[PDB]
Design a protein around this nucleic acid. Structure first.
Ligand SMILES: [K+]
Ligand SMILES: [Mg+2]
Ligand SMILES: [Mg+2]
Ligand SMILES: [Mg+2]
Ligand SMILES: [Mg+2]
Ligand SMILES: [Mg+2]
Ligand SMILES: [Mg+2]
Ligand SMILES: [Mg+2]
Ligand SMILES: [Mg+2]
Ligand SMILES: [Mg+2]
Ligand SMILES: [Mg+2]
Ligand SMILES: [Mg+2]
Ligand SMILES: [Mg+2]
Ligand SMILES: [Mg+2]
Ligand SMILES: [Mg+2]
Ligand SMILES: [Mg+2]
Ligand SMILES: [Mg+2]
Ligand SMILES: [Mg+2]
Ligand SMILES: [Mg+2]
Ligand SMILES: [Mg+2]
Ligand SMILES: [Mg+2]
Lengths: 53, 185, 144, 67, 130, 258
RNA sequence: GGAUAGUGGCCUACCAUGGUUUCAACGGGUAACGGGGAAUAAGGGUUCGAUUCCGGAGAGGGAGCCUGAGAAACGGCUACCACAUCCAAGGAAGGCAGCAGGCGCGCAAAUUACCCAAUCCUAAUUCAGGGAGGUAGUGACAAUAAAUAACGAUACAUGUAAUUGGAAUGAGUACAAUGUAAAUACCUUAACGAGGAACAAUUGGAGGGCAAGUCUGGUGCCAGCAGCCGCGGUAAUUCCAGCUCCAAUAGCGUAUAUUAAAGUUGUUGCAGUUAAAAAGCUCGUAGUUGAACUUUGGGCCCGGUUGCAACGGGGCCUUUC
């Protein structure tokens, strides 16, 4: 039935965003990704990984 | 109305968007050559594919054919002039074996770094973009320039753009004007 | 042989046979018959404006649940009545009875998408403002 | 800076052959102050309606509006 | 022309210009936060007279003028401001109210969109109709 | 469509004019005149694009208005006068004379000539007919009619035209071993000698031409222009003399100046 | 014979019964103007082409016609049909599928701007005219280039932590100048114009296809996501959010159509026992296809191209022009 549309979005707590420093856009972002992925930072976990736990 | 204006695309996207090996190779190229995005790699691969198709169509023709000879010689001349094709590989079969890195090396952003004018490819990129590099007597503020193997001995700083000239800059002016007051007088 | 003429002078039969057998393809037959113009309430167009007639709760097909909150809309172009899904969490409050809505296809070239039965269109805008720009707080619906 | 240059054998030849806008730029005979294109075209269209000189029509409307 | 409905009103402060960025404020526009407020521009300032409109380039405060190219943005009334902290003006309360109510339904079910459009245009042509 | 066209859109002009693509919407339409529309060369094109003397069409008109230009002895104040093959452009100011001939690439080359031979012109005899009152005459490639011709002059021959008295001084016949210019087709601008003429009654007559480099090509009779006998041209040939070097040899000649 | 500028059943009089067609006539449909071309394409193909050029047709629908070389012209006329304008009601005037602009229709498309400076065109003609055309305004149609940072010092384990510093620049704004018909914009620059360099990049995703979380809170077959498979019914990697990460990036997503993928239209190049498909069977016209055979083989020369050899031609006889 109707009169239930938006139930979860309505009763979803409004967690506000967390201010962080901006990311460098463009060629600087490509540089940041290249260093994060190909200087062998501690992200391997055996072979390779891209998110923590 | 006036004649149509001809225009062509200079790149081509990959068929498979999310191939991890291709993404890693593209990121390696972008990091090594200080590229802004994947569109520059796409453009280089598109140019390489056009050249490869031309050389293939020429190689299907019989040897000493007039058209094959003329067009292959012209293509080899252009590639060695731009320095992508080495001087010992003027055969039209090593043209087929050209790579993306061969074109990316002749970039002005790569050459400014390899000539010691910059500390990194990204430093060369910002220096070129900020009009600091002159190829001959002409400022070239575009990292993709394809130095012609004779302008390489001429890549230097411009008379303007105060790393190769007289003026002391723009932020140095305000810094001096603030330091004169901060000194006390 | 392979069941088709190979003779150098059999081009007429070959092309006539191909012409006859192309009718078994759905896209070719629909294009040559102009099915989209007569049928397919969107008369060969990507989008169509309409006036919302009723909010309905259409129960999704098995094995699913969660009735989908569609709207019955009368198209301005031809007066045909279609059902349009309102895709977002909520967003049924962003559409009202007797409202103007832009509808697009559901992505499956006229086939019903997902577990929604008999629904081949979705709402893109309502009262002239994007449904996504209403779901996000970027814009607000004009007062009416 | 790369441009074009012309050197006529005389000032009379320069006036005879140089375009009016370039002469006005240099300082020679100035731009002729005509009306806007819309107004000029409207004026010529209005004159297209009247047949003769127009003093006949002026005298004819001298009486009417009124008597 | 059905659906233009020139915006008649008075400028109380400042000068309005043809082609001037202005803020449309709704009759219930809160001036603190965002509400039904538009950032649009005027297309033509108009002098309204005995049924003939004269285009005007600019009009000073305390005068009567019409506006062309606006009012698809405010339903009934409202203020056009250039300040960003400009409270909307008063709601223009009248001694009468809509009290006689009737139901309307088209005989031809097919032109319900026409009925809806006519209702929406009448609800803005008449100030006291609801 | 209701009458003759008077405009010439760009990209519809003959490509041998080498007009700019984006200069404007239109190209100078060759007015009616002696040679043709396609096979012509407007004076505005010759003065603003081939000699660069004038910068605009207004300047071309200014040049033409003061009787400076002269085509075949006459002033020809027409901005788009259809100058064509063998026509003599003479300007009294900047006194040099050009004979409009075809270069090896088929364009109308700028070919300076001298006053002592700009007097005459050559003309291919288009037809030999008996006019009114039994007076024979010849019609030439440039639309000239000449009364009382030599009784031995036939079609496909060439006639030297005084261009001052406008009369025939000499005539060359069409035969094997005569110097011929190619005035149309793929080989437009080539110069060679006649090897053989295949007749093809009803159809089109074909003629084989052999250049000085021994290259032999066949072309339609309609676009061959006898200019003399081998080694003795009656006119001054252009810089390349219609050799049609291959592209490789052209590149070699270009690279021979370093 | 008439008519035409002229051929011609183009029309007329007489005469004959012919002319087209399964090699598809004729009829019907086209959301069909044709082509140069466009997209996609290993090859072969498939789809599109109203639209910058060429040809045709039309100026609301027809029809008729004047002038004129050229019109069945429409910013020429006449009538009818349909619309529709002003009227003092007697009458008179109409044709934006030209340029702007308005209404309507819609998913769907811009200024009632400037100028003849270029391109050309027209005229009695260097001079005048040109919404042809050019210029600018609007414009994320599409296309090209590529800002959003770069480099040091110091601490920790080349990287990291809002531990600091000096440089560089254009995005802008603007003397002037160039550009322009007048400009505007671009280039070139006097001065100004970075530290959160807030001068802050977004669009879609993170189960698989398909690159990226078994993170946390919420909801609990509800709300919703989901192109498809599927997720959600109190342990949600899939919804709603925060963090982090991914992809492309001044672009990204969505809908429709189309192309490749599609060897799922197969000529190349499909399949037909059981997945869809061999006619119940035979005859047979059109069509398609159809056994073998007629100067081969000797030989002597001249001679071109690639490196004395190969490959390419020509001339003679051999019962042979
Ligand atoms: K389920
Ligand atoms: Mg078509
Ligand atoms: Mg049609
Ligand atoms: Mg077309
Ligand atoms: Mg159409
Ligand atoms: Mg056309
Ligand atoms: Mg017509
Ligand atoms: Mg119309
Ligand atoms: Mg007509
Ligand atoms: Mg008209
Ligand atoms: Mg007309
Ligand atoms: Mg128009
Ligand atoms: Mg930014
Ligand atoms: Mg700039
Ligand atoms: Mg999530
Ligand atoms: Mg994965
Ligand atoms: Mg199959
Ligand atoms: Mg079965
Ligand atoms: Mg079966
Ligand atoms: Mg048979
Ligand atoms: Mg046989």
């Amino acid at each position: 039935s109707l009169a239930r549309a938006g139930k979860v979005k309505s009763q979803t707590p409004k967690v506000e965003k967390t201010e962080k420093p901006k990311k460098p856009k463009g060629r600087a972002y490509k540089r940041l990704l290249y260093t994060r992925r190909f200087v062998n930072v501690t992200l391997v976990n055996g072979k390779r990984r891209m998110n923590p736990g | 109305p006036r004649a149509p204006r001809t225009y062509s695309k200079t790149y081509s996207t990959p068929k498979r968007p999310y191939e991890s090996s291709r993404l890693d190779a593209e990121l390696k190229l972008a990091g090594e050559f200080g590229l802004k995005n994947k569109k520059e790699i796409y453009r280089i691969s598109f140019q390489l594919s056009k050249i490869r198709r031309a050389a293939r169509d020429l190689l299907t023709r019989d040897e000493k054919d007039p058209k094959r000879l003329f067009e292959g010689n012209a293509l080899i001349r252009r590639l060695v002039r731009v320095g992508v094709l080495s001087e010992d590989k003027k055969k039209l079969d090593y043209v087929l074996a050209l790579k993306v890195e061969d074109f990316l090396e002749r970039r002005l952003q790569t050459q400014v770094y390899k000539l010691g004018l910059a500390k990194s490819v990204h430093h060369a990129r910002v220096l070129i973009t900020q009009r600091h590099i002159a190829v001959g007597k002409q400022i070239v503020n575009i990292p993709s320039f394809m130095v012609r193997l004779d302008s390489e001995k001429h890549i230097d700083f411009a008379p303007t753009s105060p790393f190769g000239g007289a003026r002391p800059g723009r932020v140095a002016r305000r810094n001096a004007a603030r330091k004169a007051e901060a000194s006390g007088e | 042989g392979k069941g088709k003429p190979r003779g150098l002078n059999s081009a007429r039969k070959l092309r006539v046979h191909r012409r006859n057998n192309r009718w078994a393809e759905n896209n070719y037959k629909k294009r040559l018959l102009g099915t989209a113009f007569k049928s397919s309430p969107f008369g060969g167009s990507s989008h169509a404006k309409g006036i919302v007639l009723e909010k309905l709760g259409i129960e999704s097909k098995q094995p699913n649940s969660a009735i989908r909150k569609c709207v019955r809309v009368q198209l301005i172009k031809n007066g045909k009545k279609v059902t349009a899904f309102v895709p977002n969490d909520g967003c049924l409050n962003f559409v009202d009875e007797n409202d103007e809505v832009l509808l697009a296809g559901f992505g499956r070239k006229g086939k019903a998408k997902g577990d929604i039965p008999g629904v081949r269109f979705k709402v893109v805008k309502v009262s002239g403002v994007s449904l996504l720009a209403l779901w996000k707080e970027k814009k607000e619906k004009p007062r009416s | 800076s790369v441009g074009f240059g012309l050197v006529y054998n005389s000032v009379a030849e320069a006036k005879k052959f140089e375009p009016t806008y370039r002469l006005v730029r240099y300082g020679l005979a100035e731009k002729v102050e005509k009306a806007s294109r819309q107004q000029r075209k409207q004026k010529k269209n209005r004159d297209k309606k009247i047949f003769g000189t127009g003093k006949r029509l002026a005298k004819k409307v001298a009486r009417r509006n009124a008597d | 022309d059905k659906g233009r409905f020139y915006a008649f009103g008075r400028v109380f402060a400042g000068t309005v210009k043809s082609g001037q960025k202005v803020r449309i404020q709704g009759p219930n526009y809160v001036p603190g936060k965002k509400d039904d407020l538009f950032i649009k521009a005027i297309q033509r300032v108009v002098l309204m007279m005995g049924r003939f409109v004269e285009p005007i380039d600019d009009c000073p405060a305390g005068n009567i003028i019409g506006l062309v190219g606006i009012d698809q943005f405010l339903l009934k009334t409202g203020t056009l401001t250039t300040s960003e902290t400009a409270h909307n003006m008063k709601v223009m309360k009248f001694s009468v109210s809509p009290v006689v109510q009737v139901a309307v339904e088209v005989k031809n079910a097919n032109d319900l969109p026409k009925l809806v459009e006519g209702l929406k245009r009448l609800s803005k042509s008449d100030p006291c109709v609801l | 469509a209701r009458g003759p066209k008077k405009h010439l859109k760009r990209l519809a002009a003959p490509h041998h004019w080498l007009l700019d693509k984006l200069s404007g919407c239109y190209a100078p339409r060759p007015s009616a005149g002696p040679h043709k529309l396609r096979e012509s060369l407007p004076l505005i094109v010759f003065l603003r694009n081939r000699l660069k003397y004038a910068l605009n069409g207004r300047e071309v008109k200014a040049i033409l208005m003061q009787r400076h230009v002269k085509v075949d002895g006459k002033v020809r104040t027409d901005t788009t006068y259809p100058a064509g093959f063998m026509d003599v452009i003479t300007l009294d100011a900047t006194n040099e004379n050009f004979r409009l001939v075809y270069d090896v690439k088929g364009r109308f080359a700028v070919h300076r000539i001298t006053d002592e031979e700009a007097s005459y012109k050559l003309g291919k005899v288009k037809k030999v007919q008996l006019g009114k009152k039994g007076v024979p005459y010849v019609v030439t490639h440039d639309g000239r009619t000449i009364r009382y011709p030599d009784p031995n002059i036939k079609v496909n021959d060439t006639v030297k035209i005084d261009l001052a008295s406008g009369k025939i001084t000499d005539f060359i016949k069409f035969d094997a071993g005569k110097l011929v210019y190619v005035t149309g087709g793929r080989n437009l601008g080539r110069i060679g000698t006649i090897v053989h003429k295949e007749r093809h009654d009803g159809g089109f007559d074909l003629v084989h031409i052999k250049d000085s480099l021994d290259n032999t090509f066949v072309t339609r009779l309609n676009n061959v222009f006898v200019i003399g006998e081998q080694g003795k041209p009656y006119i001054s040939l252009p810089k390349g003399k219609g050799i049609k070097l291959s592209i490789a040899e052209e590149r070699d000649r270009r690279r021979a100046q370093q």
